[PDB]
Symmetry: D2
Amino acid sequence: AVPAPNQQPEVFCNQIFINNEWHDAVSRKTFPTVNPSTGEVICQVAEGDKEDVDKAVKAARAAFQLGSPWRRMDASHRGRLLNRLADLIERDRTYLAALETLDNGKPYVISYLVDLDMVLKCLRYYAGWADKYHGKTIPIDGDFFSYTRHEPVGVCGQIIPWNFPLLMQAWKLGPALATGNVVVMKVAEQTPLTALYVANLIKEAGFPPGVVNIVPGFGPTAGAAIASHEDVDKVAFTGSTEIGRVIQVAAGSSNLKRVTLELGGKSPNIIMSDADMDWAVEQAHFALFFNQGQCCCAGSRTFVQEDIYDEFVERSVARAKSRVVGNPFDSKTEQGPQVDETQFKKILGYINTGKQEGAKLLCGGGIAADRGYFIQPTVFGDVQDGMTIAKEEIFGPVMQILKFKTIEEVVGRANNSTYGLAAAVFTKDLDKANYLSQALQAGTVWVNCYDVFGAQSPFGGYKMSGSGRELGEYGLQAYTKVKTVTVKVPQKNS
Amino acid sequence: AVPAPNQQPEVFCNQIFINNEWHDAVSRKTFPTVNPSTGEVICQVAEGDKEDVDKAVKAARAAFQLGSPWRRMDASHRGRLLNRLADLIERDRTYLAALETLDNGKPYVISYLVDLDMVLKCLRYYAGWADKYHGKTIPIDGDFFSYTRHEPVGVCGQIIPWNFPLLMQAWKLGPALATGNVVVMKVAEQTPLTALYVANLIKEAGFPPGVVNIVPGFGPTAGAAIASHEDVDKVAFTGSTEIGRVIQVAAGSSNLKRVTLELGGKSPNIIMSDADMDWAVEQAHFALFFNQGQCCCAGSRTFVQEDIYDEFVERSVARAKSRVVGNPFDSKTEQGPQVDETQFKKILGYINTGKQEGAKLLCGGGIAADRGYFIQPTVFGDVQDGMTIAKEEIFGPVMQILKFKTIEEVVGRANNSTYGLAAAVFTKDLDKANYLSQALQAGTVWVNCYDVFGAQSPFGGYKMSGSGRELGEYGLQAYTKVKTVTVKVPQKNS
Amino acid sequence: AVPAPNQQPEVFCNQIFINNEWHDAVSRKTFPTVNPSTGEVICQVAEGDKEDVDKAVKAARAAFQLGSPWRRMDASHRGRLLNRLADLIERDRTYLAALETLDNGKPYVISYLVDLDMVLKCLRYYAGWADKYHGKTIPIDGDFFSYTRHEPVGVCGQIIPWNFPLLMQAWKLGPALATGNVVVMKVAEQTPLTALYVANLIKEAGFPPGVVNIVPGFGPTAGAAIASHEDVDKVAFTGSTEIGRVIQVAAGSSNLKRVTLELGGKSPNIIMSDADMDWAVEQAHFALFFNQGQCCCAGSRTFVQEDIYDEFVERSVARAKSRVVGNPFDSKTEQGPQVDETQFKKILGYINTGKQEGAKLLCGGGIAADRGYFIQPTVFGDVQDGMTIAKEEIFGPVMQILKFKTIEEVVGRANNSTYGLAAAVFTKDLDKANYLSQALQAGTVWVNCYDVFGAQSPFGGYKMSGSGRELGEYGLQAYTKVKTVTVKVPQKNS
Amino acid sequence: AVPAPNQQPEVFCNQIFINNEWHDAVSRKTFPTVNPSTGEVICQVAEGDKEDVDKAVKAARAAFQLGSPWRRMDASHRGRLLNRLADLIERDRTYLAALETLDNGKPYVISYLVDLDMVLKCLRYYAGWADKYHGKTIPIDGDFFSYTRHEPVGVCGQIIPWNFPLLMQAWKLGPALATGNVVVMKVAEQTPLTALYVANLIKEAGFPPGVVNIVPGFGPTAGAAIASHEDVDKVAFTGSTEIGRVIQVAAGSSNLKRVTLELGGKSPNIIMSDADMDWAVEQAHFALFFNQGQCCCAGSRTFVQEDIYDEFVERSVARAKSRVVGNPFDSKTEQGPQVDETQFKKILGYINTGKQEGAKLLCGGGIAADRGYFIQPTVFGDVQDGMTIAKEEIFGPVMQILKFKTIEEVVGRANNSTYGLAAAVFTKDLDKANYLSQALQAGTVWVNCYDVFGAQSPFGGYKMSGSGRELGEYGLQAYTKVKTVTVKVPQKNS
Ligand SMILES: NC(=O)c1ccc[n+]([C@@H]2O[C@H](COP(=O)([O-])OP(=O)(O)OC[C@H]3O[C@@H](n4cnc5c(N)ncnc54)[C@H](O)[C@@H]3O)[C@@H](O)[C@H]2O)c1
Ligand SMILES: Nc1ncnc2c1ncn2[C@@H]1O[C@H](COP(=O)(O)OP(=O)(O)O)[C@@H](O)[C@H]1O
Ligand code: NA
């Protein structure tokens, strides 16, 4: 039930978005954005830098001034605008899905049925929160009346990755806007197109000038300018652990702005012996291969109980070999190309590193096409905890299958990691599922499923996977300041 | 680890408690309270009636007047008082436990380790809620500041049963006092002693006069006087569905006061084929026989899958035969006498009715001693849905074991009842437990356990088992009035 | 900014709505509905009775069966449906507003700008709550995992009055539907039209058959049939205190169903001497006269401090005399006719009762036109607390102005009432506002404003003004059952 | 009602506290702690460093291990322990108050009546939260059961200042312990005594070894070691903005641990023309001079409306001159000495800087005694926003009085600051109070009062005054990790 795509969608937006107007970079420079499926340049995009970020923050701050349309606006109206934006996105669903595929490389079918669906649900869910995040009236001691107001944080800098251009944008705009904040967004240089188009819809939706500003550009330039800005009240980052540290330090060095980090992981997918074989195999495959493996919480560590190891591995390899790689606009395509050349090589490097360390290559392991950044679905057997491919996030179609004996054993092994973004357990036993879900040190533990995100459920990590949460009511906390007002009263009564 | 009990505790309180003072009934009348273990009169107790309830309500209302000590007192101080009450009760724990056994009949060991333990945990749990039940500040449209205050409901009438005199008292006083209400409590004529002694501890703890008033007496007299009183703002009742209807009608006929009912049930205990046999049998036994079967949520309908039916029944019968019946003060005693003669006969009648309808009597079925109201642990096999013993709450040590085939089948049969207080499921399968816990129409669904009450978890029923909840944060809603204050402000900003 | 109305809107729906189908009464009877502005019959409408209510409940019950489309539907989707209904109402906004005026009598402008605007905001508000009313995971003692599910209460009987036909409908449908209940609604015989038209839109919106059933008819027949029905789980009533008692008794006499009552009031509007005179006079006028005085929380007791009494009264009288009474479809019209002849006489009766008691008639006091049920804006001065016009709810354009000296005095006088729905205070002083908003025993206290309802702020009364609340998060509590599931786990850890 | 103090309290604890044991620093070094009233050394205290912090973190990590006594302990029991700690502190109340005064210098009367009272209230408040911080069950789309668990963050490093030794300790221990975290606390070198004694009480209360570890020592050594430790999950700091930046950078450079900062401020105290003169003067005086001005939210910028400026200044100067300075153990002493020599000089420097810049010295301005660090209550009039004493936090008994004309003016001037911890308004006007409380950019806005802290009300700052909040339910968020468990179920139903 998917409409025919325009395999060559036209690009209308490729500049810097500030105050609902399109501007060229102050430097006039532009950078190209590549179609990962062909390696060809799609178009030129304004290259924002420090001076462009400065103009954006200034517009954002002005839109956030006391008495401004955005600040005076009824909370319920913010919800109306979010719902309107959702409607416009649904109107241009087919176009956006195609553009997403063109710039990112993910299958159009998935782009339409998954990405945009979730974008719509995210925006619609948050529209509903706009006028429901209450403060409190507190029964403090003495003759006083005390209450709290949940005010917006202010100017929020949002730096998003390229794996889910639209979804990441929505996960950030949703809570930020619902709570009345203003945004300065820096989209990934590899996939700036869709987000820039949405900025056009944000204008058509009626959001006041300066409430949302998007600055396309490079990380060390535009991104760092945001993180170090003296007038940015908060910076939300989603990407590598490496850059996540840079952000945190730039924040402490500047104005002590709030910082939430959504880093990657080496998510353990534990398959117990009593698990439904058919389901576990299909889900473990999805768990890793989803979105060309370019998933922050990809199940890149598939722990399988010894009794079912051989059979599991056999089925997984068969499924991996049957995974159709090709043109993302083709309906049969299950896996498209990787985002860019840099990731293309980085992943080939990890594949090589895997063979070198003793991991048993069961299938794939090389380039899947001469044109574009396509990689064959790769699976490694008999992986060990000490191996590089079992410690570092590959972010590609490379599966690692480890073997284990006891449930107490797998707990320690799955937990022995610097990451803790997600985890999964497949079993039919009640006690085992409860034991594991509690023992596993991950922000999200799936039972007999994987990658089940609800706009309603919080998503974040433990340890070096980041701090703070996104989605659900918890996503609102990070975009809110608590002000307490305590008033002296004549005589307090219960 | 249980101290030696005074098998003949002295009684210090046996009058009406109003304004922290002991009074005789206006009529001067007194009624006897019996020791169910010997059938002997323990002592005389003031027989409160309408004129006494009138005095109590008057006292309560005065203590609730704006500006009074109780109304002005800091919420955190109410918590202090509840904690103080808990301390006093722990001080006299050994005494109270013995007095409880003397008047109620339950084993002293259970009285000490279970009842009083839960009373202490309940009072201490609620003590902590006293200053944490917040109102809200609401983001209403327009230039207004809107907020809510959670105010006490007022004079609360509390009519409690005899199965757990102390615990029932605590379950009512806890949320009511934490929220700042005043109480006029009517304790069961069969077990007024412990509650009256606690009233003395309430005065010792420092609660202002009139905050808690206890009127011992009969139901149709004192109880009905409370339910129909024009100045009682709320009545919480716990007992038979029969009287529960009288209470609700009395409330609609008077001042439209709030009403919460905690009626009995015919709670289904579903044992799946893959359940841990040893655990299931022990828990199913506990599920019904606990407190001489005098438990509102007793598992009086033990549904067992056909594959394990015969084995289950065998073990259950063995366990029932081994259940020690005798002097409640004896450490070996597992089951004491029933509360009184009326219940004694009522149970014997149901046992008789069971034989006559075709239910297979597997053990017991008659009187267990010539002195006291002791009944043999009875078990009925091959029970059918249409039988009386499978529809009406016996409230005695009489177990009903039914057989079933499919999971879809047992859902419908377990749900086919006018009651819906509790239910339980024993299984090792994840999907089965979740399917059942969701499909079962009961206020509380236990999985692989039974009678697991936390002072922190809500407890109430569906359908004709009552309305409203007790325990947990939900218990507070029933004792709170929501007042909304909407103020016009110069200019609203987020 | 109001579109031209069709002063003679066509009626498309005038039958009983069950299972998304239009049916005639089983009896085949019909009753006429009158246009209060002309006294002429608009059309004939199906006259539902017990038999029709029975059919409605059965349909509702079927739509609520486990596994049904409405029960399985994603919570987010129920919100989608409510938003769709809101869009349909907005589409037909001009028509509905005209039809509301035709049947009820309130000015078209008000119907368009106020009633319909509020209905859209109400449904859109609740659409957002659909997937955000979370249950809890409770940290109970022992090795257990305890949580709560907020389930729909079931089949909800909703009986609504005629003062605000559409808004009352929305206030009931919103929370009920967002929480997944099914409804059997009984609309007022004086104003059944708009609600029946909305049932058509409910069908067009996609709501499953039986989710919403409307049975137009009389109270003693259809209404009583719902209140006494054995299969209705909850009954929500809004109307006279007289009938509210009937409903509560009918509920306790039947199945112990849940009951929430939204009864009237004799709301105090207190004007302190330091209030802004211009604003207080305009607001007090609106507080009472709004909607032909046919408002449950009308400020029918305007208490004015002695120092500004003469001046206030003078301005109030002038404003009352200048209030334009006439054809509700005329833009200049501020006051339309009263709903029907019965109310017309009832008010004439109170006006006379006022004169007889000694209250000073300052203006109006008689019929305002020979056609329709128009009454002159009436104002009584120097009213006393003992007078009947100061104790009973007139529900008409009859203002009562009382004089007072101190703030301690007015508190006692404003509180001395069987009603406690709302109250207001006009003052510039912080301490006075806080003192009174705390002291006043009313479910809603407005400071320097009146009739400020937010779809997000709770609305209900104290004492004999009812139990339970509507609007805001609190409105969801009444349409929800709390199920507690407590699971045994291997070993609990924090 | 204050017991007679031991002006020379014994010191029982002066070492490093790890695993409920007292240890000397690994280096064996010790630093002296001075009595600011006499300048004499009280005693020697173990000088902890990196190696000591290492040992503390290890013990804390061990106590936090899955299956440990602290991890398995009932949430309600954590509350019992906190309540037992409070009891022990109350038992030793007079001793602790004396010790607090000896080491810090604040008046014994204040230490006893204010500090210790608040410590008890804080611990008792949080004891109540131990088992009431619920997770949620979320209505996610699809056939899934999704819920959240609120888990402890882990090993929390807590670095506290010297202005409120005991209170700051309780403010940190309360929420951290209530939520089941383990602590490694670094107390200020100027005031380590009281906290160390409390550690002894923590052992006596029954807290498992390793749950609380206190390491006295210097900042750049022990403090930095905690902030940069690889195994510390969270660091909460309270002190200078200067060090607060060091902490945040140390965290981003290490393990991306969570960071909450409680920095100082230059809190504006606005006195409107209509304020109660007597009350405003007394509160403004309290606002600034309290605790020798060593208060993070000291009202160091007293803005006064021009119409009442002269009278206000006059009264304030009179009140400052009558403030009794002297031996803190004397009942008549209102002001004790400053914490240490460094602060003593820093303050004198600001005083001098004040005179140099043109501020009008109205009283004091010099040393108040030859012995001890006493400074005279100083007041500066006609202060200007540009002046150093109007921008930098003095932290001493030095008041700045500024003049203003309009309410719109004062908001901008009050907001024009790097800080935003607190603020206050004195007015009798409702609209003014609401306008200001909303407009002021501060974490806490007081109306007609100052320094009103409730264990129940959140406390934190805006901008460079820090991030995160303390006290109230909000204090728990910082010490909790949210884990989401999403389980696949057979068929989801509402
Ligand atoms: N606002 C407050 O709550 C508050 C309280 C006390 C002091 N202060 C500020 O502190 C100023 C001067 O006193 P101070 O310098 O001793 O306070 P500070 O902020 O430096 O001291 C607070 C805590 O930080 C620790 N610390 C110091 N340097 C550290 C470092 N490099 N890394 C990690 N931890 C370190 C200290 O040992 C102490 O335990 C005061 O004038 C005021 O500005 C503020
Ligand atoms: N008619 C009544 N009106 C009010 N309360 C009653 C009435 N009858 C009994 N009660 C009270 O209800 C509580 C529980 O008793 P009930 O449910 O009637 O069990 P029983 O009467 O079989 O002992 C006791 O306080 C009892 O006195
Ligand atoms: Na200061």
